[PDB]
Amino acid sequence: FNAKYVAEATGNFITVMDALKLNYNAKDQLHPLLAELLISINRVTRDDFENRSKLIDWIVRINKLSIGDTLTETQIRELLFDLELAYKSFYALL
Amino acid sequence: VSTWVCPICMVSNETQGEFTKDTLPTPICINCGVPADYELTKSSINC
Numbered sequence: 316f317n318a319k320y321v322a323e324a325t326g327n328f329i330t331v332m333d334a335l336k337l338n339y340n341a342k343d344q345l346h347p348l349l350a351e352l353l354i355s356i357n358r359v360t361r362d363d364f365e366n367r368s369k370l371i372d373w374i375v376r377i378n379k380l381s382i383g384d385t386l387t388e389t390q391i392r393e394l395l396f397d398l399e400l401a402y403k404s405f406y407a408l409l
Numbered sequence: 410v411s412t413w414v415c416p417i418c419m420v421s422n423e424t425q426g427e428f429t430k431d432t433l434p435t436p437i438c439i440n441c442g443v444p445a446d447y448e449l450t451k452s453s454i455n456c
């Protein structure tokens with residue numbers, strides 16, 4: 316694997332998780348973070364892994380929100396779990 | 410007119426004008442709203 320792309324994807328996973336733990340919950344805060352995550356992941360590999368599709372679902376869902384909608388406290392908790400699981404599975408692929 | 414497939418969500422998009430490595434800003438996917446990464450998208454581009 317291209318080591319620079321692996322470092323960039325790994326940094327992006329932790330950055331989105333840290334954002335969620337800091338209470339970022341709006342479309343305009345989360346969309347760019349998830350966008351850059353998904354781009355960096357594809358740079359490493361285009362292969363499937365656990366929860367890859369789920370993270371795609373989330374960025375599609377977040378894109379359809381109106382300007383100033385937030386995720387619910389329990390939506391945030393779900394997305395965090397799904398991200399943690401994707402991160403574990405991406406790391407196993409390495 | 411340029412057609413392409415989003416490398417994030419896989420939906421077909423259509424944009425006005427050429428889509429080359431020099432186009433800036435890049436077109437945005439209508440479905441997931443991610444700006445198209447040229448290197449990931451280039452094999453799918455037709456004009």
Ligand SMILES: [Zn+2]
Pocket residue numbers: 415416417418419420438439440441442443
């Ligand atoms: Zn898309």
